[PDB]
Design a protein around this ligand. Structure first.
Ligand SMILES: [Mg+2]
Ligand SMILES: [Mg+2]
Ligand SMILES: [Mg+2]
Ligand SMILES: [Mg+2]
Ligand SMILES: [Mg+2]
Ligand SMILES: [Mg+2]
Ligand SMILES: [Mg+2]
Ligand SMILES: [Mg+2]
Ligand SMILES: [Mg+2]
Ligand SMILES: [Mg+2]
Ligand SMILES: [Mg+2]
Ligand SMILES: [Mg+2]
Ligand SMILES: [Mg+2]
Ligand SMILES: [Mg+2]
Ligand SMILES: [Mg+2]
Ligand SMILES: [Mg+2]
Ligand SMILES: [Mg+2]
Ligand SMILES: [Mg+2]
Ligand SMILES: [Mg+2]
Ligand SMILES: [Mg+2]
Ligand SMILES: [Mg+2]
Ligand SMILES: [Mg+2]
Ligand SMILES: [Mg+2]
Ligand SMILES: [Mg+2]
Ligand SMILES: [Mg+2]
Ligand SMILES: [Mg+2]
Ligand SMILES: [Mg+2]
Ligand SMILES: [Mg+2]
Ligand SMILES: [Mg+2]
Ligand SMILES: [Mg+2]
Ligand SMILES: [Mg+2]
Ligand SMILES: [Mg+2]
Ligand SMILES: [Mg+2]
Ligand SMILES: [Mg+2]
Ligand SMILES: [Mg+2]
Ligand SMILES: [Mg+2]
Ligand SMILES: [Mg+2]
Ligand SMILES: [Mg+2]
Ligand SMILES: [Mg+2]
Ligand SMILES: [Mg+2]
Ligand SMILES: [Mg+2]
Ligand SMILES: [Mg+2]
Ligand SMILES: [Mg+2]
Ligand SMILES: [Mg+2]
Ligand SMILES: [Mg+2]
Ligand SMILES: [Mg+2]
Ligand SMILES: [Mg+2]
Ligand SMILES: [Mg+2]
Ligand SMILES: [Mg+2]
Ligand SMILES: [Mg+2]
Ligand SMILES: [Mg+2]
Ligand SMILES: [Mg+2]
Ligand SMILES: [Mg+2]
Lengths: 116, 128, 117, 58
RNA sequence: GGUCAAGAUAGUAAGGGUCCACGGUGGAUGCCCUGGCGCUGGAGCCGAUGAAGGACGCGAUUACCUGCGAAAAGCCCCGACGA
RNA sequence: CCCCGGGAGGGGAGUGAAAGAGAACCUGAAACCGUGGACUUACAAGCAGUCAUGGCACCUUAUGCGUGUUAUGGCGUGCCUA
RNA sequence: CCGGAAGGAGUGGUGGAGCCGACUGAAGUGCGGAUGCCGGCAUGAGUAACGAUAAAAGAAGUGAGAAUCUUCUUCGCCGUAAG
RNA sequence: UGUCUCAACGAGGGACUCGGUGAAAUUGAAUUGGCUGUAAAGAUGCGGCCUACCCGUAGCAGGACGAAAAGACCCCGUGGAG
């Protein structure tokens, strides 16, 4: 049974679940938009949304919080001093997804997730 | 156009295949290819090319390619009206079979059957 | 000289397969099961050729005493009284058809009722 | 051998009997409003890349 | 014609069945001989002058077969044949 | 030579008596897989046939004549060995 | 369609080069069985499996076509080893 | 001390759904119900009576005297071997 849910196991253990959502947040932040499986995108959406909301605070604490997950110093810098400040007057919804059909090899359906 | 005996009817009536094209020896099993082909069937040839663009089977590919030679042959060799074609008939039949023996537990072997397919499809000026 | 089976087996086999016609499943397309079905079919054939005559006897009887009871008689009674009347010797087939021509069967009933009072 | 095993070979009829349920569903394809090609719904028109505006290359 | 009532019956095929038609698979059957089998008869030993059977090579180009053997798909003499 | 295809494969054109021989190259049976069509099947108990009758369909050893299919009734315990 | 049976003929379709009928003679001469033999094709079924639970992600490139090939940056795994 | 009263919650790998590749043992043919009775004496398949619209998917193992090895026990053979 499962009448309350944090998201997905994907098909991975606690350690990986994390390492993935971290890496994919890092790439969407470095890259503005990326396409991946529709699932992994839906799973990415709130992690990265909350991450930008953390960095939106400006003080050293929020930067060190972001450093906890985005372990590449330049992406954290960009999110801190570039992207979050831009999202200043935006109350969430930093992120959007749109779906782009189906893949050849596994016949899986990819989609794009991009900064708003 | 009556004739008198076989050999002359053979030497002056060469007997053609309008709208027809075959993809012999495609390396897929006829069962799956038949699923795709069954969705194509009595259908406008546009929708044929559409449905095939958006249907997720590995067999949509060759079935699409053959769907084109029909069109091509209807419009080049046979002088038909492309704005009027449809899939009057389409079917898959069995080719030869690549039998590959494969190993198994505790010494025995086993024969895997890579089936092949003859995908034929045949277009026509759907009047009424 | 060698004398392999050649043409012969296929021809007997096709003879059975053509006897098969609308036999369900393998019964009509695999030889052995067609042959075996035709064994039991032999049984049924000969015996039914007998039986059909019991069958039509039964049906004429049904109709004849149906008509006999239309007038207040019955097969036992009507058949006997007709038998008592200078032996009519109409077949049971024929008495039925006169149960398709009621005005006559009626008079046969009155006649059987006579030779019986 | 193989604990459970099947008893009689299944009929040509009953085998196609079960299969009355494997027919594929054709996509509900629709006409893209800008590229004048066909596209899956709630996805991005592959032909022109458009999705009200235009997101993907080519 | 209209409503209500009571009664009777039709068509639909997801799929299946028998028959037909047209193909696909497969390679039986018919025809055929490039290969065998037996009987009859013929002929019957090779080798230290190197046998039997092989290895490695020989070609413009050569993997396999044939032929040959550093004089290597071959060299010399005689007879035959005559493009 | 031309067409669709990366190809494979095919459709034309041409050779040929023939391509109803095209190099997966004489014939090309059967099992086995399919497409189309006739007649049919979703209250039904079944060695699958057999007899009987009605319905529908077709007419090249073939209009009383059937042939194919079918509904309902009756009947009906595969083959062989032992 | 024909004969009492094994069976035989007519006609139409294929096929592309050999073959009926009669009389006699000789047989490797007649298949459903043999857990028979060789070969082909079915059912189980689009099922079980895809071979260590050391994860993988995004960008870029090439190409007819990429989850799987190349490149970049990260991640995870062995390290008396999985050098 | 979850062996147990007596099992719960959670994890991962399968099982499930989609796309790719795709076996096996077995298979007289099958249009393959229940009770009771009868039958070579344990009946889907005979008799009577009941019940039951067509077709699947996930699952359980009572039947199909389920599958596998022409019983290793037992007897038999004027069988064999140590
Ligand atoms: Mg998985
Ligand atoms: Mg970029
Ligand atoms: Mg907050
Ligand atoms: Mg000519
Ligand atoms: Mg081994
Ligand atoms: Mg009698
Ligand atoms: Mg009513
Ligand atoms: Mg259908
Ligand atoms: Mg000879
Ligand atoms: Mg030597
Ligand atoms: Mg040399
Ligand atoms: Mg040599
Ligand atoms: Mg020398
Ligand atoms: Mg000379
Ligand atoms: Mg000469
Ligand atoms: Mg070309
Ligand atoms: Mg070509
Ligand atoms: Mg041809
Ligand atoms: Mg030919
Ligand atoms: Mg072949
Ligand atoms: Mg070819
Ligand atoms: Mg070829
Ligand atoms: Mg020839
Ligand atoms: Mg041939
Ligand atoms: Mg149809
Ligand atoms: Mg049909
Ligand atoms: Mg009914
Ligand atoms: Mg009946
Ligand atoms: Mg004949
Ligand atoms: Mg010739
Ligand atoms: Mg013999
Ligand atoms: Mg046999
Ligand atoms: Mg016998
Ligand atoms: Mg075999
Ligand atoms: Mg395993
Ligand atoms: Mg490119
Ligand atoms: Mg990659
Ligand atoms: Mg991998
Ligand atoms: Mg690699
Ligand atoms: Mg680079
Ligand atoms: Mg080492
Ligand atoms: Mg649990
Ligand atoms: Mg679990
Ligand atoms: Mg039933
Ligand atoms: Mg009793
Ligand atoms: Mg009982
Ligand atoms: Mg019965
Ligand atoms: Mg019973
Ligand atoms: Mg009911
Ligand atoms: Mg189980
Ligand atoms: Mg057993
Ligand atoms: Mg024994
Ligand atoms: Mg002894």
């Amino acid at each position: 049974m499962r009448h309350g849910k944090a998201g997905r196991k994907l098909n991975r253990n606690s350690s990986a679940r994390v390492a993935l959502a971290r890496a994919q947040a890092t790439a969407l932040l470095r890259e503005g938009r990326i396409q991946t499986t529709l699932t992994k995108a839906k799973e990415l959406r709130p992690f990265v949304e909350q991450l930008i909301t953390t960095a939106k605070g400006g003080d050293l604490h929020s930067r060190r919080l972001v450093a906890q997950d985005i372990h590449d110093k330049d992406v954290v810098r960009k999110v801190m001093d570039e992207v979050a400040p831009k999202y200043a007057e935006r109350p969430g919804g930093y992120t959007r997804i749109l779906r782009v059909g189906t893949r050849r090899g596994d016949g899986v359906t990819m989609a794009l997730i991009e900064l708003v | 156009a009556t004739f008198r005996n076989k050999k002359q009817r053979k030497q002056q009536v060469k007997l053609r295949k309008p709208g027809f094209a075959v993809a012999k020896y495609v390396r897929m099993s006829p069962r799956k290819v038949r699923l795709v082909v069954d969705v194509i069937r009595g259908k406008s040839v546009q929708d044929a090319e559409d449905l095939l663009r958006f249907i997720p089977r590995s067999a949509s590919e060759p079935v699409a390619k053959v769907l084109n030679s029909a069109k091509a042959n209807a419009l080049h060799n046979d002088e038909m009206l492309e704005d009027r074609l449809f899939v009057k008939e389409a079917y898959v039949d069995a080719g030869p079979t690549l039998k590959r023996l494969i190993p198994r537990a505790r010494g025995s072997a086993n024969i895997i059957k890579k089936r092949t397919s003859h995908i034929t499809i045949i277009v026509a000026e759907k009047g009424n | 000289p060698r004398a392999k089976t050649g043409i012969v087996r296929r021809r007997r086999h096709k003879k059975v397969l053509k006897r098969a016609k609308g036999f369900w499943g393998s019964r009509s397309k695999q030889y052995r099961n067609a042959f075996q079905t035709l064994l039991n079919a032999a049984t049924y054939e000969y015996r039914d050729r007998r039986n059909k005559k019991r069958d039509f006897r039964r049906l004429w009887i049904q109709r004849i005493n149906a008509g006999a009871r239309l007038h207040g008689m019955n097969y036992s009674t009507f058949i006997n009284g007709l038998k008592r009347a200078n032996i009519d010797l109409n077949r049971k087939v024929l008495a039925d058809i006169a149960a398709r021509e009621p005005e006559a069967f009626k008079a046969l009933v009155d006649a059987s009722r006579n030779a019986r009072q | 051998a193989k604990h459970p095993v099947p008893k009689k070979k299944t009929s040509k009829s009953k085998r196609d009997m079960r299969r009355s349920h494997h027919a594929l569903t054709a996509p509900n394809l629709t006409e893209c409003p800008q590229c004048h090609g066909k596209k899956l719904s709630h996805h991005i028109c592959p032909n022109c890349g458009y999705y009200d505006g235009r997101q993907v290359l080519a």
